[PDB]
Amino acid sequence: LFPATGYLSIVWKTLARALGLGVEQLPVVFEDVVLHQATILPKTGTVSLEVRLLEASRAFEVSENGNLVVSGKVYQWDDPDPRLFDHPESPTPNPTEPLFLAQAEVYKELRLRGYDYGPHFQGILEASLEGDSGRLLWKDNWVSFMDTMLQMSILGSAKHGLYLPTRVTAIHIDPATHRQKLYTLQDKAQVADVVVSRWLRVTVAGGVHISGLHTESAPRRQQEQQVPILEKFCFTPHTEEGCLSERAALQEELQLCKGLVQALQTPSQQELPRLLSAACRLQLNGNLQLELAQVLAQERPKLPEDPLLSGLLDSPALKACLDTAVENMPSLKMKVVEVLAGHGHLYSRIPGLLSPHPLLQLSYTATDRHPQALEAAQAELQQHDVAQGQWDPADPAPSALGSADLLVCNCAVAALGDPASALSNMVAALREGGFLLLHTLLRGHPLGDIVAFLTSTEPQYGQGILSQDAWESLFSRVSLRLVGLKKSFYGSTLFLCRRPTPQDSPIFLPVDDTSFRWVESLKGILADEDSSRPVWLKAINCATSGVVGLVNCLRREPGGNRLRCVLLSNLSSTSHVPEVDPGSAELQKVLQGDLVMNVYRDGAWGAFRHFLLEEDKPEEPTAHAFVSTLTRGDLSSIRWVCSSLRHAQPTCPGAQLCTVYYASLNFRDIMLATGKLSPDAIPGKWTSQDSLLGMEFSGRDASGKRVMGLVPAKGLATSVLLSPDFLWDVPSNWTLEEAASVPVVYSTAYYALVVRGRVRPGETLLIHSGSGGVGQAAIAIALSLGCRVFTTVGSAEKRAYLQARFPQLDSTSFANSRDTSFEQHVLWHTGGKGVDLVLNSLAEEKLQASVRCLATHGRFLEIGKFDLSQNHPLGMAIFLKNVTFHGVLLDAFFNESSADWREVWALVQAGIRDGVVRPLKCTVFHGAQVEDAFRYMAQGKHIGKVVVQVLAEEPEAVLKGAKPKLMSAISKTFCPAHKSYIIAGGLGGFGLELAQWLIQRGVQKLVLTSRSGIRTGYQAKQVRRWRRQGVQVQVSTSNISSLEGARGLIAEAAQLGPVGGVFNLAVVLRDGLLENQTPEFFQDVCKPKYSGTLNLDRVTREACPELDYFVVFSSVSCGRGNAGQSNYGFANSAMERICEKRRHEGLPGLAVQWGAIGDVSGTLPQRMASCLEVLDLFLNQPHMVLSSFVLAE
Amino acid sequence: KLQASVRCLATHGRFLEIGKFDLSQNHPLGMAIFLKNVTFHGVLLDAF
Ligand SMILES: NC(=O)C1=CN([C@@H]2O[C@H](COP(=O)(O)OP(=O)(O)OC[C@H]3O[C@@H](n4cnc5c(N)ncnc54)[C@H](OP(=O)(O)O)[C@@H]3O)[C@@H](O)[C@H]2O)C=CC1
Ligand SMILES: NC(=O)C1=CN([C@@H]2O[C@H](COP(=O)(O)OP(=O)(O)OC[C@H]3O[C@@H](n4cnc5c(N)ncnc54)[C@H](OP(=O)(O)O)[C@@H]3O)[C@@H](O)[C@H]2O)C=CC1
């Protein structure tokens, strides 16, 4: 974006030219600078700005393509006053200056805020912890200097989000005094001082003076260019049974097929059952199903879509098998080539499932008997790297393909002819090792035999359907070995065979030493370049071993292609302890498989794998929830999410929690939901960025008494906490549906008229928008006194409605609100005097018309927000007529001024008693149709107030119930306000932000552990701000590495309050290739991650009964492997085992595998906001280990 | 002076204008102050 101070330089140079001087001798004054639209400089091309000066009027103008950009007054400073730039009298001399922000810390804070300033705009050499005094670097440009002054202004503020200059009241510049104010640092760089004074609203730096700076929230670009791919790391046994037994749709499909088969031997909405029905209508025995036999070949192209046939592919089994294939690949590049692609259609699936791998180079070709088929979807092939080729199973593989890594057939649907020839040709073609992925049906199960019957063609071999032992023996003939099998309920299977590679006797290295002495041994073994004996690591004793990460990190390292691991980690303490010995048969088979990863958990032989996590947002039953716009400006994203009111069981008499039967929608809510209004324009440091919907409700108090109240926000919910001073007692005659409409509209009407306009009987007043709630309340109040009322409406039906509701009105008391014609009406019917009170919720051109209607001694009440927000001019000449221009904002009561509110409360109550306060009309929607209500109000045809029925009303006056009915709202993480939370290494770059997240989510008692304590300005600023907010932060030096340290840390947390959460973010990095590593390096790297987490586990099992969160952060190096981080991998992989073993028992546990963190591999850094949102997602899942990274490009 | 004095107004402030020049010249008045509850009074005792 073009800097706001950039326009200043342009206009300044224009004036200098017009005066015949230069910038270096033209002290200048700006006044009433208004920035209208932000200009977005393009990547290529240029943008043209023209500056026109009205010298006589001392006004300028900046325009772009005929559109106004900036406007204001610029004139020379005739007689500069050097003392104007003196640093204003300060409240504190600030002598100590103990800690301060350096450039890196200040711009890290700014970047977290949203600003992405680069080098040329980085000028704040250092700043105070409050952003009130600083030291600004001086290059020879003014744009950067003034932009840095504005950056200093922004830095110290407490608000969040992106704020940009919109209005400035006065700027004074004096280059001579500026050059007199600069000075040289100990280096050769020039520098100037800056002071920000919020009390006086002035920023002074050198020969510049910014006063009256106004900044307004800017909508986020909603680009969300980062979409992290999220996976779950779960154990996966090599052999599985009943793969799809969980599903019932496939069960119903098979039931229908079984019924059709019984009909044959004793809906047609899916391919296989429809073909079965086609057989049924005819006689299978008669004519040898000649007609159907001809029709049998017709359906084969559409046959694979059958959900029964393609169930295994859709299941995670295919992903697991492909992941196993890629893991054993010696390098990051793989070669795979289909066979019989014209029927298997695996080209669609395999490339997609392998995409999440960040560093996978894939070569794919679809090989078919006849090109006439694969040409059918050639276009659908081009977008992917899938190549083209002609090949037959019986024929030998052309040397073009030759050594192949992976071979996918899907013969379950494709016709493989003779299995012997196909297997022979393939296994010969396959590279030594490699993999042969085959998907075929089986005999000995209903679907297989049914299809076999249906087939009338030899080449399919009944679709090549044999018994499981038949396939196993055939594999035996071709010398392959099975390293994968996945049976399915409906009989389909998924084999994965690996052509063996001859190997010498492996070298076994136990890895159970506690001192990491084996690191020397493994290094020595791997040193030898000329050798191929594969090392087989053993991790038998410690189930908290992390050899998986060690292996992954070492595969990429030199000579790492000869590394295999065997770990025996059983979560259940009562499982069989395997005998892994050179003579043991179990070791014989596991070594025969020639598979890198071999973990034996709870009686099985599998390997950890990755799987894409379900995208659905977790949902839970919950009494307390609120309406949230998960994406601003998209009413279709409305939904119900959990609320912090679930906590706060004890409550002081000052507040009391109330159920919400009917919640109203006011116009502010529509503006917020549509995005036309920011979430920070409302007073009160809400900080949620959402949940600011709803201002009034009608429900029942805790005691069961009926009530209606007004709240600053969060009224659209199933519960609402507020002080009793903002509640009224709905009378017996009315109904809660009616009571929802009274509060806000009548309170604002009374406060505007009686308390501000001090209206009296016999007065004439103009009330705009008569049909609206405020209009109707004002009309009802006015006529009760006995006033004469003019109203403006937008249609004839609204005139009819107002006439029906208010009989006292007459045809002469209505005007038009869509034009400025009402001015003439009011002036004519009033005799030209005008009106006394005016209530104006209207826009610019119409607001001026209202001012012309005021009579002498009139009073203009402004309840709108557009002209006031944009700072439009108001001619003072109207005041020569005795006139009071009021500005009414009812929301000012919630923040402060509680003494005045009781007056409005009493006025409203008196009106309700007397009968003046009569409920408006209500168009009631339901709890599940909140979006419908929002859209209906957006249309604007509503007369009366839209309402939402959260719950129905019982007949009785009092019920003294316990809790409302339970609904289903998106689950989100909130924490009690009476529990403590521990963040090991909480002063690091990540951990301060995790605390900030926790503090925003309710945490009041926090403990941060760090070896060196507070040591930087950023940490001091953060801790001071949190303590000022009222949080009992407490920094401890307890090192969780030793058990004494863990016990002490938990003791401190308990003394502060019961321990609820434990987050371990401690990290010490000692990077290096295996050749340069040492045992002590591994010890140091594993102290905080592996020993600390074990000690936390022990201490929490001993003395933490109310704990609900146990989170430990890992890295993708453990999962995807990384070269030169072996110690990091071993430390992290060992953490995951503890978390997994905690959940099998029942205790909380969760380990996150992050990618790269940006704000504080082949994957881009992930911004902090996305990280925290994804983290909020992960704390609700039922899983153990989870991952999050953003793929490159 | 008048524009400087407006900015001194606090929340729920009240401005009394017993002057006449700025009113007679119909000089502009920024309406952004009314976002703070503020009443602008034009006091003319000649009207009684
Ligand atoms: N700070 C304060 O003191 C408070 C401020 N207010 C403001 O005062 C006003 C009171 O109105 P409110 O109670 O919200 O009533 P509504 O928003 O329900 O109605 C607003 C009025 O504006 C017109 N209108 C409504 N919807 C549309 C639309 N979609 N398109 C065009 N015109 C429309 C109608 O008049 P017409 O028939 O002429 O179309 C209608 O009577 C609002 O501007 C509100 O923001 C309200 C209370 C507190
Ligand atoms: N790119 C990234 O940042 C990624 C990070 N992660 C995860 O995030 C975390 C990194 O934390 P982050 O703050 O960013 O890293 P930093 O290195 O910036 O901070 C680490 C913190 O841990 C503290 N610490 C280390 N060992 C101990 C110990 N024995 N006792 C007490 N405190 C200790 C350090 O104390 P001191 O200040 O004295 O040094 C420091 O405060 C790890 O859990 C890691 O797995 C993983 C993936 C991506």
Size of interface A-B (CB pairs under 8 A): 87
Other Cβ atoms within 10 Å of A706 Cβ, number: 23
Partnered with residue A363 across adjacent β-strands are A335
**Contact residues on chain B for A837, CB-CB shorter than 8 A:** none
**Separation between Cα atoms, residue A907 and residue A15, nearest integer Å:** 58
Question: How close B34 comes to chain A (CA, Å)?
Answer: 5
**Separation between Cα atoms, residue A425 and residue A394, nearest integer Å:** 6
Inform me whether the C-beta atom of residue A856 falls under 8 Å from chain B C-beta atoms: yes
**Total count of residues recorded for chain A:** 1193
DSSP track, A561-592:
GGEEEEE---SSTTS------TT-HHHHHHHH
CA angle A667, A672, A675 (to 5 degrees): 125
What lies within 8 Å, CB to CB, of A939 at 6+ separation is none
- Which ranges constitute the DSSP H helices of A3-137? 4-19, 103-113
**Separation between Cα atoms, residue A118 and residue A1019, nearest integer Å:** 23
Other Cβ atoms within 10 Å of A491 Cβ, number: 22
Q: Establish how many alpha carbons lie within 13 A of residue A679's alpha carbon, considering only the half-sphere containing its beta carbon.
A: 25
**Ligand 2 pocket check for A1122: Cβ under 6 Å:** no
Task: Copy the structure tokens of residue A991.
Answer: 């951990």
CA distances from A947 to A360, A698, A936, A942 (A): 55, 10, 11, 11
CA distances from A60 to A41, A72, A213, A555, A756 (A): 22, 6, 19, 67, 39
Helix (H, G, I), strand (E, B) or coil at A522: helix
**Total count of residues recorded for chain B:** 48
CB crowding A332-368: b at 16 or more within 10 Å, else e: eebbbbbbbbbbbbbbebbbebbebbbeeebebbbbb
**Separation between Cα atoms, residue A443 and residue A450, nearest integer Å:** 9
What lies within 8 Å, CB to CB, of A343 at 6+ separation is A300, A304, A410, A413, A414, A415
Task: Copy the structure tokens of residue A77.
Answer: 């400073």
Q: What is the DSSP letter of A129?
A: T
For chain A, the straight-line distance linking the first and the last C-alpha, in angstroms and rounded, comes to 25
- Backbone conformation region of residue A838, classed left if phi is above 0, alpha if psi is from -120 to 50, else beta: beta
**Separation between Cα atoms, residue A505 and residue A508, nearest integer Å:** 9
Inform me whether the C-beta atom of residue B9 falls under 8 Å from chain A C-beta atoms: no
Cβ atoms of A421 and A395 closer than 8 Å? no
Cβ-defined contact of A887 to B41 (cutoff 8 Å): no
Inform me whether the C-beta atom of residue B27 falls under 8 Å from chain A C-beta atoms: yes
Amino acid in the structure at residue A552: N
Cβ-defined contact of A887 to B35 (cutoff 8 Å): yes
CB crowding A515-532: b at 16 or more within 10 Å, else e: ebebbeebbebbeeeeee
Burial (CB count <10 Å: 0-12, 13-18, 19+), residue A224: exposed
Q: Is A1052 annotated as a binding residue?
A: no
- Backbone conformation region of residue A672, classed left if phi is above 0, alpha if psi is from -120 to 50, else beta: alpha
DSSP track, A621-632:
EES-EEEEESST
Q: What is the DSSP letter of A1178?
A: H
**Separation between Cα atoms, residue A872 and residue A866, nearest integer Å:** 9
What lies within 8 Å, CB to CB, of A486 at 6+ separation is A239, A240, A243, A312, A317, A320, A321, A493, A494
For chain B, the straight-line distance linking the first and the last C-alpha, in angstroms and rounded, comes to 28
Helix (H, G, I), strand (E, B) or coil at A254: helix
C-alpha torsion sign, points A404, A410, A411, A416: negative
Cβ atoms of B9 and B36 closer than 8 Å? yes
Question: How close B46 comes to chain A (CA, Å)?
Answer: 10
Residue tagged active-site, from A132, A147, A174, A306 = A147
**Contact residues on chain A for B9, CB-CB shorter than 8 A:** none
Cβ atoms of A617 and A606 closer than 8 Å? no
CA angle A347, A349, A355 (to 5 degrees): 105
Cβ atoms of A87 and A100 closer than 8 Å? no
The closest ligand to the CA of A1131 turns out to be: 2
Partnered with residue A127 across adjacent β-strands are A101, A134
Other Cβ atoms within 10 Å of A589 Cβ, number: 12
SS (HEC) of A133-198? EEEEECCCCHHHHHHHHHHHHHHCCCCCCCEEEEEEEEEEECHHHHHHHCEECCCCCEEEEEEEEC
CA angle A452, A454, A459 (to 5 degrees): 60
**Separation between Cα atoms, residue A136 and residue A148, nearest integer Å:** 7
- Backbone conformation region of residue A1131, classed left if phi is above 0, alpha if psi is from -120 to 50, else beta: alpha
CA distances from A642 to A119, A687, A949, A1001, A1180 (A): 43, 17, 18, 12, 12
DSSP track, A646-687:
GS--S--TT-EEEEEEEEE--HHHHHHHHTSS-SSSSSS---
CB crowding A630-639: b at 16 or more within 10 Å, else e: eebeebeebb
The two counts, helices (H) then strands (E), for chain B are 2, 2
CA distances from A768 to A362, A782, A896, B39 (A): 69, 13, 29, 20
Helix (H, G, I), strand (E, B) or coil at A1043: helix
Task: Copy the structure tokens of residue A1114.
Answer: 């890992």
Could you give phi then psi for residue A67, rounded to 5 degrees?
-115, 135
Cβ atoms of A213 and A153 closer than 8 Å? yes
Could you give phi then psi for residue A821, rounded to 5 degrees?
-75, -20
Nearest CA to ligand 2 atom 38: A1011
What lies within 8 Å, CB to CB, of A208 at 6+ separation is A85, A145, A146, A149, A171, A172, A173, A178
Out of A105, A112, A982, A990, give the residue to mutate to test ligand 2, the one with the largest number of ligand atoms within 8 Å of its CB.
A990
**Separation between Cα atoms, residue A1183 and residue A1186, nearest integer Å:** 7
Could you give phi then psi for residue A687, rounded to 5 degrees?
70, -5
CA distances from A446 to A254, A264, A443, A462 (A): 9, 14, 8, 13
Ligand 2 nearest atom to the CA of residue A1154, by list position: 47
Cβ atoms of A126 and A102 closer than 8 Å? yes
CA distances from A954 to A698, A708, A720 (A): 13, 16, 19
A147 catalytic residue (yes or no): yes
CB crowding A682-700: b at 16 or more within 10 Å, else e: beeeeeebbbbbbbbbbbb
Nearest CA to ligand 1 atom 25: A940
The binding-site residues of ligand 1, defined as CB within 6 angstroms of any ligand atom, are: A 666-667, 745, 748, 769, 771-775, 792-794, 798, 817, 841, 863-864, 888-891, 940
What lies within 8 Å, CB to CB, of A335 at 6+ separation is A363, A403, A404, A405, A406, A431
Cβ-defined contact of A885 to B40 (cutoff 8 Å): yes
The closest ligand to the CA of A1007 turns out to be: 2
**At which residue do the structure tokens 């920094």 appear?**
A1035
Task: Copy the structure tokens of residue A208.
Answer: 């510049």
Least Cα distance to A156 among A195, A182, A99 occurs for A195
User: What spacing in Å lies between the alpha carbon of A1067 and ligand 2's midpoint?
Assistant: 4
The closest ligand to the CA of A681 turns out to be: 1
Ligand 1 nearest atom to the CA of residue A744, by list position: 47
Task: Copy the structure tokens of residue A1128.
Answer: 């990091």
Cβ atoms of A609 and A234 closer than 8 Å? yes
Q: What is the DSSP letter of A695?
A: S
Inform me whether the C-beta atom of residue A571 falls under 8 Å from chain B C-beta atoms: no
Q: What is the DSSP letter of A1153?
A: E
- Which ranges constitute the DSSP H helices of A512-571? 518-527, 547-555
Cβ-defined contact of A889 to B35 (cutoff 8 Å): yes
C-alpha torsion sign, points A482, A488, A490, A492: negative
**Contact residues on chain B for A862, CB-CB shorter than 8 A:** 34
**Separation between Cα atoms, residue A469 and residue A475, nearest integer Å:** 10
Least Cα distance to A409 among A350, A488, A485, A468 occurs for A350
Tell how strand A854-862 and strand A883-887 pair up. parallel
Out of A1014, A1065, A1111, A1139, give the residue to mutate to test ligand 2, the one with the largest number of ligand atoms within 8 Å of its CB.
A1065
Helix (H, G, I), strand (E, B) or coil at A721: strand
The two counts, helices (H) then strands (E), for chain A are 39, 53
CB crowding B30-47: b at 16 or more within 10 Å, else e: bbbbbbebbbbebebeee
Q: Establish how many alpha carbons lie within 13 A of residue B37's alpha carbon, considering only the half-sphere containing its beta carbon.
A: 16
Burial (CB count <10 Å: 0-12, 13-18, 19+), residue A795: middle
Cβ atoms of A666 and A920 closer than 8 Å? no
Task: Copy the structure tokens of residue A84.
Answer: 């104007």
Cβ atoms of A154 and A130 closer than 8 Å? no
Cβ atoms of A434 and A406 closer than 8 Å? yes
User: What spacing in Å lies between the alpha carbon of A866 and ligand 1's midpoint?
Assistant: 12
CA distances from A444 to A35, A299, A492, A770, A1179 (A): 79, 25, 11, 80, 45
Cβ atoms of A241 and A615 closer than 8 Å? no
Q: For B29, which of A167, A876, A886 is closest by C-beta distance?
A: A876
- Backbone conformation region of residue A573, classed left if phi is above 0, alpha if psi is from -120 to 50, else beta: alpha
Least Cα distance to A201 among A189, A209, A191 occurs for A209
**Separation between Cα atoms, residue A895 and residue A682, nearest integer Å:** 10
Nearest CA in chain B to A752: B37
